[PDB]
Amino acid sequence: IPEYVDWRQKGAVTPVKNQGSCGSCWAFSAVVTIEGIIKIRTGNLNQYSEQELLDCDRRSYGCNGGYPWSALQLVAQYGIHYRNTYPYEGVQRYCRSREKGPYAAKTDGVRQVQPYNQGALLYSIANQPVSVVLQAAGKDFQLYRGGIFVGPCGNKVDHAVAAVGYGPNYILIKNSWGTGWGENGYIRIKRGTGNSYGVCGLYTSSFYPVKN
């Protein structure tokens, strides 16, 4: 795998979104890995619905929490609609897939990256965007305005985000807070620290969509 990977340069990531006051990070996270693998595989970049995952994933908890592996599984099983046809409302409501007609895309499966293993994650990111969790509660993470973030942060993961690249000393992450947070909505987290947890617990649980 190469020294630098940046899926935005390959035209495989859409504009940064803002989840607002809904704890829908898990759905935002799962959707940037669906947008990236559809572009990688079909050549077309499209935006997909976070609201659909929020309303329809019965294992997750709507606003206040969920699982991007559960969200990723629904799309393999069923599929997902364009963001346009099912726009973000920031509130969980009834599942409306049926009403919005046929799915725009569908996936074939969900895989997990071997945890607490930096090289395993970096090999998955070299192939497609990956869903990743981290501890985002400390005000150092919240007030991030740029640079390679080294912490301080613990490993009490609470925020799902997506990794879309890496470099020699960092992993590149798409967050769902505004384009005004961090580096136009992105954060480069220090890697190669020797901590198996990863900085802020970044190697705790990472999943990616399989599309054939």
């Binding site: 990070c25 898990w26 206040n64 929490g65 969920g66 509660a137 993961v157």
Partner: peptide, 5 residues
């Protein structure tokens, strides 16, 4: 304190 969301 801090866990899934």
């Amino acid at each position: 304190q801090v866990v899934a969301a």
